Amino acid sequence: GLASANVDFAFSLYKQLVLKAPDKNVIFSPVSISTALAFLSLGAHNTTLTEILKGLKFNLTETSEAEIHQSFQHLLRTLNQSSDELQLSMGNAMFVKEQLSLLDRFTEDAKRLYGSEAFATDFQDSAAAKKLINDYVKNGTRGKITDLIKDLDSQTMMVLVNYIFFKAKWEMPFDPQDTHQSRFYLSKKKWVMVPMMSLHHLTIPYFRDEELSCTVVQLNYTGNASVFFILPDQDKMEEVEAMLSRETLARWGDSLEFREIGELYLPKFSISRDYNLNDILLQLGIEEAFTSKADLSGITGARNLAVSQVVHKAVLDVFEEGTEASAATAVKITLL
Template structure:
């Protein structure tokens, strides 16, 4: 058997549309509302996991990128996809395995959720995964959603046992002697509940779904925890009719991304038993938007001797959080959204990118954020860009300690009660757009606040005209939604 796990960012359609989907594809006891708010539109991250009788072969990265659709650029639009395929192992054990008490049913409500512990692990995992990805493509753009990847893997760990479970959770940078498994899942439950709260300023949607083969018998513990902890919807799916199964999954993805991602799944294996989908979708408006009339063509130095012309956005006399790190020779600027969530941009001095990357540790990021102070920048220049990436994480996650789940020794017996599943493939795809404003910010486009008081000291100009790092953070949970490196804004 094989499970395919896809991470995907999306906005929900109307309640009527979702109810119609459930009526068409009922799966008791999953045929119920997930309670997710509607109306979210613009940023996405996604993950998929498949269980089947043969390894899942993912489509070429190009098909996903060619099917992304955007209707103009938002201030910051990110889309990501995670796909993990699970296949049968050689040592199938018939019968059922006694599962421990459901995490979701434990009485843990008397203890407060340690959101900071989850955020700390999220930061550590983000930087560790980034270093692995960057080392494989040292001179290319990097963009991924650590939140999408971590939620997808934590969701998958609900079905893991023994060493397989330990490696997944420790690979996500949790200290299991300090933070028990139940608390980890409860932390993700709290994270999902927090980011799904309706907001007039921030449009953010995160959720999970299961597409379950009609003949697949899941353990009640797995289905109960998936529903209670990860708010997963579920749809009964006939994978013997691969065309219909692909349409069902792709329609779900298309609806929840408002048509921005289509044909996510192709060439499903006939023995696929289950597809898991995780999505995160975010749209935010700059607190101080760039004026499109001030955008101009300018040089971006991809190396010391090579440059490309890019559209360069600009702000004059703007007050933003700023820090100059002389020790690491880099400049840190935070651009807030109207919701007070923010994007952090790190600009190493010329030739210092590798040195800064080598020092990327949770304490480094914490020192940067703690050292930020409001500062007036006379001229701020940031390229307008759209970048994308695709990674086969089965080649990367073992470097973070997640090894057994990809082998015949994998123990995912918590899914069906049989120790016959292993992960064959994990693919993560992401798209990031950065522009002057969102479609809803047009009214603010023409306005510009100028500070007319006399300037004291030298002019401060920050020009992102060479490779830089970026981090998009969620304020309330202190979690990193997206992390990346821009080495060439011209390359998709």
Template sequence: KDNNQWAQQTAPCNWSLDRMEEARVLYQAEISTADFQQPHEAKKLINDYVSKQTQGKISELISALDNQTLMVLVNYIYFKGKWKTPFEPHFTRESDFYLDKKRTVKVPMMHHMFLTTPYFRDEDLSCSVVELKYTGNASALFILPDEGRMQQVEASLQPETLKKWKDSLRKIDDLYMPKFSISSDYSLENILPQLGIKEVFSKQADLSRITGAKDLSVVHKAVLDVAETGTEAAAATGCCPVGSALILQPLKIYFNRPFLVMISDTNTQTPLFMAKVTNPKEN
């Protein structure tokens, strides 16, 4: 995980050497320069940097820049985890994944017999929860809502719910999980205010002491791959001041319809990545 600041080579950016050093010390941020008067070349420079740092998982964080750009702030995180108990590839079979009541797609369905992994059935929220551990200090919670209960479960993803699930996990012996690779990208100007980060996007915000400009745009992109050996995940954010759970037996569970996944640090219980998988065949 790291931060990087890209400033215009000859910009009227109000970043003194002292302030740049403060950013390096306080935020562990590298300081780089780019010529935003050549937006295509600057975009390639930043995207190549992010691609290298995320092992090629995020190849195009910034889709467009213009020559009014004065600074780009980049934050990225890259995670590669190996399952503590990997899935055996020769057990993987093509299987149906139910997109809804009428549509299915064929997916490579991984199968783990005699896995003995933690599992919990939450009758209150109508979902099933499985925990898979990585080597090291990370684990993944896979959350499978009953049909028609996805929104209810999503709305209940609070710390107390996660704690209840963690405290209630018991063992299962048979697990079916699709391989998948998903990605998403968002413009965060409308999302962050819903999380309480409002003032920086308001008309009253003034970033001119930093960049000489007042406006701000924020983009975010994330990628998540899950396969037999483990998981690769990466996320990056760019900030630009501009001018059916079929439980066939009590100890068997099929992830064969839309589900949620959350990867966390087991030492701090901090969520690192969270995703909703509605179609494992689509990014």
């Protein structure tokens, strides 16, 4: 259940991000945003609540709020399990104004289901609250996300935060001696020089998708993670993006077949993007959380809280030894 919704949510977010900025790199963590919004829904009731759950792509005629929260509790436990092969961690936290009293049911559920520890913070000292949240994210992301919070309105009552850290080694690592500056074509006639990594003579999952005019390959990390790489033919990127969905992803995976490949060329690169998700959440039906009709009463016992802003930042580093990727989501909440 949670798996299907989280994938549906991933591709819906992707499509909206591409719409907003058609010419930009994209990098985000769907699981971080889903978990942060599910955390928020722990404190929601009535229309505010049902909008979030449906915006996260859950079918409430087949699931309930308690089952959704248990799904996320189990997901967080599974992701944070020890591994000798891959570094993977996800944390949640809430930064709460010192003079504010919270429902015991919320504080207890947030700990038990989301592993969240509350942090008393003086939001009226913006620069202290700002560094306090940013240090927590910076530390959780091993230094990769440093400025998740750019501005904090002084009347902020609470900020919910999720971060994810991912660091893995390739099953088949690249040799840096084989990394050479080469062209990366931004368009059919414009290029930039980048370090191009290469592997030689390898057998990997492969699928030439003639229906969508793209090539799919799968590169494994050591541990339970892998990466699907999709290469549209020239001028076919938009056509492929339009076909992204759980069914297309399932079709690609079911069509992959091991195949010997003479040469694989992949850039060494690092990219980051920072997002204001207010627009996209609005388009998914998550609206009442942002208005005076906001019902976050399950947090303090009163309908006196409203979301002001949801932000997301993510960083992806791809290199010869493996991949490092990190992201965090923050939900800013003010008095209603």
